Design a protein around this ligand. Structure first.
Ligand SMILES: [Cl-]
Ligand SMILES: [Cl-]
Ligand SMILES: [Cl-]
Ligand SMILES: [Cl-]
Ligand SMILES: [Cl-]
Ligand SMILES: [Cl-]
Ligand SMILES: [Cl-]
Ligand SMILES: [Mg+2]
Ligand SMILES: [Mg+2]
Ligand SMILES: [Mg+2]
Ligand SMILES: [Mg+2]
Ligand SMILES: [Mg+2]
Ligand SMILES: [Mg+2]
Ligand SMILES: [Mg+2]
Ligand SMILES: [Mg+2]
Ligand SMILES: [Mg+2]
Ligand SMILES: [Mg+2]
Ligand SMILES: [Mg+2]
Ligand SMILES: [Mg+2]
Ligand SMILES: [Mg+2]
Ligand SMILES: [Mg+2]
Ligand SMILES: [Mg+2]
Ligand SMILES: [Mg+2]
Ligand code: NA
Ligand code: NA
Ligand code: NA
Ligand code: NA
Ligand code: NA
Ligand code: NA
Ligand code: NA
Ligand code: NA
Ligand code: NA
Ligand code: NA
Ligand code: NA
Ligand code: NA
Ligand code: NA
Ligand code: NA
Ligand code: NA
Ligand code: NA
Lengths: 142, 142, 150, 49
RNA sequence: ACCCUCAGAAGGGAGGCGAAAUAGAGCAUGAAAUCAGUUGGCGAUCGAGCGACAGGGCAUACAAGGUCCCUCGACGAAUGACCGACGCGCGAGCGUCCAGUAAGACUCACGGGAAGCCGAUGUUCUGUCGUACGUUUUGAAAAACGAGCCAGGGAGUGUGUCU
RNA sequence: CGCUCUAAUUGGAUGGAAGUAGGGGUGAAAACUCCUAUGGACCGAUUAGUGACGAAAAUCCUGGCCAUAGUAGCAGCGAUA
RNA sequence: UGUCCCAACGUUGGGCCCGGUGAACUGUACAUUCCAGUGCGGAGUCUGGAGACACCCAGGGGGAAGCGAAGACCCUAUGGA
């Protein structure tokens, strides 16, 4: 609730990794970022394999644990965590000043970062984070 | 009603342009602690320096992070080596006679700690008349 | 033995010490810890409650295997060291005694300082199996107490 | 014979003790033992002239 | 000694002697390991050879160190431009000139400033590097061997002969 | 570089030596030195000598000490008191 | 015939809490780990990730190639008996 994001990025039809990479870069530069429409971000490849990767991650674990998110919410955020030294003081700060959301809880429409947009017209082999999450067993709360 | 050090405490030696450059170098560059390897890991092991002799010693092998090894390359500039920070050359003094031959422009004097108060007062007063600063002065209340 | 480790103004101060008491040095630490800042009077009441088994002495450092006590606040383990407590009640009786004979109101005085110190051990030897023997000692405790007018 | 006046013997391996000659459970004779002999001491035989 | 306390020739308090009792009886001095209380720093969301070198926070009686900070200006090694003008290149961009100029570590001069203030010390934070020590070993952080911690002790000496 | 004691030469100390604790300065360094506190009687330098002269280690020796832990044992036995 | 199918309930002493007494083993250091990797090829400490708020009580003992014993096996020694 209420997040003074200096930047509001829109993930709809954007390549998760590429976006996540740019969001980390900024959060490390001090920017407070908020990612919007996570459920609508995308990742290229052959759905079948992509899903396998993530389903595996959900299954990996033990007493010590390996908590992996199933909501496009978490998914996106953990992706960003991977692009930051989240265990160093500076990195936890940056990571913490970053939040992902399902849909867009703001008034302003977020911005689309350069080179992260995917062309549905010239691209058929890709997936929606939400599709992924539905396959993971997540509850479609969006 | 306040303490005042005897003698020419403020006195400053006069040094060639070169010497003052070199003295200022020494003070800028500094040198490493050169403490014994791992003295901080074991109480029984004192700080005094001993050459690391372990065939495997990380320091003896020069592994960055294990400390600097004593070498001649670390020596101080010939011209200044041994000078008190003020630039003065010290002269150890035990009595009044020792004051003879001392250039109060070039050398300051340090009274052996053993010398008792009585002989101090004599040395300290004649030292000042001879234009020589005493590095370890008595503080009297004036 | 010890010597007062703190400076006390004689005009507003009463003192007292226990010498080489053979009792748990670990209990003393806890007891001292617990009663400092209290009123000599409050202290006595407390230690008597402890001896009674109604008030527990928080054991914060030497608590291994000690069972939790409901009455301990902010902590969990604690016991009722009656021996050590009694020796403290002797220390207190003495301090409040000296305090009155000096014109103060003993009981009303604040425990400005109280500390226990292990002065030694009365050495003992316990026969063990296999023809060998091992130590079986007794701690010897000293304890300082300084009373101060409110 | 300073420090040698003893029948002290070392138990050898077996009791988790260093091989040091002992007697009545007290180490003896060897230089590194309190009350043991002095390794290389001053000698009457030496020519100091 | 005397007085108070205490079950008390104990102990404690107050007091007395002495230069000193922190010289009060295994009583000169009184280290380290270590214990109690306590001050400074850190601290119950976070990672382990415990540090070295850099740089920040906080903390600091005197003494034995006195430096340090900013404007500007002087000097200025290697290195070394932006902009703009012209000319190339599909393009990223390059060439010529402006220019070996502006810049450029250290050091110094004028002016202004700091006294916890600079150094230094304690602790803590960040950066870089970093799996003890010694030994055995081709190869040891080693799941090879040794040590709980500290202090003290602990290993090329003498005679004769030869060279 | 540092230690012991001997010698020659030459100094310091009850107007406070050695040692110790904390702290300032020098030396690439072994280590040297100063200040404060403690201590209360000894202590250096230079030169030439001297040697039971330097430790982190040896399942090293001796003493002291911390954790272990207010933990194990103080129940088990044909005598449950 | 509770050896077993297949375990249950009960008795006594312990165990647990409290007063008193009060050891030993063991300790290079650091140490909340887990999955992998790597490394003298059998890592709490390296590398990558994951996980992880601190302390305490009880437990049965997975791991510390746990503690205990300078391997009895095997070989080597111009060793012993
Ligand atoms: Cl899991
Ligand atoms: Cl990190
Ligand atoms: Cl496609
Ligand atoms: Cl040299
Ligand atoms: Cl104890
Ligand atoms: Cl310069
Ligand atoms: Cl030799
Ligand atoms: Mg040490
Ligand atoms: Mg228990
Ligand atoms: Mg027997
Ligand atoms: Mg002897
Ligand atoms: Mg004494
Ligand atoms: Mg917190
Ligand atoms: Mg091998
Ligand atoms: Mg020694
Ligand atoms: Mg001479
Ligand atoms: Mg021992
Ligand atoms: Mg236990
Ligand atoms: Mg019966
Ligand atoms: Mg890791
Ligand atoms: Mg063997
Ligand atoms: Mg055989
Ligand atoms: Mg034979
Ligand atoms: Na992808
Ligand atoms: Na998982
Ligand atoms: Na505890
Ligand atoms: Na409570
Ligand atoms: Na409680
Ligand atoms: Na004998
Ligand atoms: Na042993
Ligand atoms: Na002779
Ligand atoms: Na600091
Ligand atoms: Na070895
Ligand atoms: Na090693
Ligand atoms: Na290994
Ligand atoms: Na032990
Ligand atoms: Na020797
Ligand atoms: Na049965
Ligand atoms: Na286990």
């Amino acid at each position: 609730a209420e997040f003074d994001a200096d930047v509001i990025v829109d993930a709809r039809d954007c390549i998760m990794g590429r976006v996540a990479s740019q969001v980390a870069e900024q959060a490390l530069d001090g920017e407070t970022v908020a990612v919007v429409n996570a459920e609508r971000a995308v990742i290229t490849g052959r759905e079948e394999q992509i899903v396998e990767k993530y389903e595996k991650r959900v299954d990996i674990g033990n007493d010590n644990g390996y908590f992996y998110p199933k909501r496009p919410d978490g998914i996106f955020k953990r992706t960003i965590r991977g692009m930051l030294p989240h265990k160093k003081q500076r990195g936890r700060e940056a990571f913490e000043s970053v939040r992902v959301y399902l849909g867009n809880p703001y008034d302003e429409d977020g911005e689309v970062l350069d080179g992260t947009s995917l062309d549905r017209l010239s691209n058929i082999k890709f997936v929606t984070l939400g599709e992924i999450s539905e396959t993971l067993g997540a509850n479609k709360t969006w | 009603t306040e303490l005042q050090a005897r003698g020419l405490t403020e006195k400053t030696p006069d040094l060639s342009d070169e010497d003052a450059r070199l003295l200022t170098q020494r003070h800028r560059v500094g040198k490493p602690q050169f403490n014994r390897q791992d003295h901080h890991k074991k109480k029984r092991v004192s700080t005094s320096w001993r050459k690391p002799r372990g065939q495997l010693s990380k320091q003896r092998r020069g592994i960055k992070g294990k400390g600097d090894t004593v070498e001649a390359g670390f020596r101080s500039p010939t011209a200044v080596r041994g000078k008190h920070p003020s630039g003065f050359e010290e002269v150890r003094v035990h009595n009044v006679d020792d004051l003879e031959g001392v250039d109060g422009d070039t050398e300051a004097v340090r009274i052996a700690s053993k010398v008792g108060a009585r002989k101090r007062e004599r040395i300290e007063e004649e030292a000042e008349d001879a234009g020589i600063r005493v590095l370890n002065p008595t503080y009297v209340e004036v | 033995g010890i010597s007062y480790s703190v400076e006390a103004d004689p005009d507003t101060t009463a003192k007292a010490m226990l010498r080489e008491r053979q009792m748990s040095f670990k209990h003393s630490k806890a007891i001292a810890r617990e009663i400092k800042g209290k009123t000599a009077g409050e202290a006595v009441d407390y230690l008597e409650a402890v001896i009674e088994g109604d008030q527990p002495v928080p054991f914060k450092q030497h608590n291994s295997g000690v069972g939790h006590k409901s009455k301990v606040d902010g902590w969990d383990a604690g016991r009722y060291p009656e021996k050590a407590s009694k020796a403290f009640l002797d220390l207190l009786e003495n301090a409040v005694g000296n305090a009155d004979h000096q014109g103060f109101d003993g009981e009303a005085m604040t425990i400005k300082h109280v500390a226990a110190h292990k002065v030694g051990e009365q050495q003992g030897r316990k026969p063990r199996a296999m023809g060998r023997a091992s130590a079986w000692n007794s701690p010897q405790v000293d304890v300082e107490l300084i009373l101060e007018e409110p | 014979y300073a420090g040698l006046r003893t029948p002290a013997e070392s138990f050898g391996s077996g009791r988790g003790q260093a091989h040091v000659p002992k007697l009545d459970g007290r180490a003896r004779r060897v230089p590194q033992a309190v009350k043991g002999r002095s390794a290389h001491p001053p000698k009457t035989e030496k020519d100091r002239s």
